[PDB]
Structure 1
Amino acid sequence: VPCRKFVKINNSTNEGMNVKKCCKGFCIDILKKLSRTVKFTYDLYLVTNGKHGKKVNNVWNGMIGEVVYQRAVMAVGSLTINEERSEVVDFSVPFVETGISVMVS
């Protein structure tokens, strides 16, 4: 499926371009099957702020900054769940069992 990415030219100006790219994988298939079942219209794009989310003096970033400040509707992509994220928004039921691990030789 197509999406956009606001890539800036330099650090001198804040002006950038919305380069359109293609996407596939796991969550893309999940979103396509949700569009098959629910039969809605979606607005898919990418975030350019950064990672998942981190509060710096009551200011969130990334997908948390997009959803909590209501610049989007929902986060379909991958996101870890802890206490304050469940405080600020309402997660759905978990579907995949993904914990943490340590890689060694």
Structure 2
Amino acid sequence: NVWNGMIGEVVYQRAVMAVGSLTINEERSEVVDFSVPFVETGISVMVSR
């Protein structure tokens, strides 16, 4: 029940915003407020040709 990393730093008032490769998630949106997504970042599969 303790957040680390980006969400941990932002939730505990240690920072104002978290700029980076932050995937917007349901728990993350519940805990902190996210902005409008500026790029699509889904989950995908990488395989050898």
Structure 1 length-normalised TM: 0.44
Greater relative contact order (Cα < 8 A, sep 6+): 2
Give RMSD over aligned pairs: 0.8
Moved over 3 A (4+): none
Deviation at 1:80, TM superposition (A): 1.1
Deviation at 1:63, TM superposition (A): 1.1
Deviations 1:31-89 (A, max 9, x none): xxxxxxxxxxxxxxxxxxxxxxxxxxx11111111000110000011111111100011
Give the Cα–Cα distance (whole angstroms) in 2 for the partners of residues 60 and 98 of structure 1. 22
The structure with the largest strand share of the pair is: 1
Deviation at 1:94, TM superposition (A): 0.8
Structure 2 length-normalised TM: 0.87
**For the pair shown, which has the larger CA radius of gyration, 1 or 2?**
1
State the identity as a percent.
Answer: 100
| DSSP 3-state at the match of 1:65 | helix
Give the Cα–Cα distance (whole angstroms) in 1 for the partners of residues 40 and 3 of structure 2. 26
Stretches of structure 1 that go unaligned for 5 or more consecutive residues are 1-57
| DSSP 3-state at the match of 1:85 | helix
Deviation at 1:98, TM superposition (A): 1.5
> 2:36 maps to which residue?
93
Give the Cα–Cα distance (whole angstroms) in 2 for the partners of residues 82 and 63 of structure 1. 13
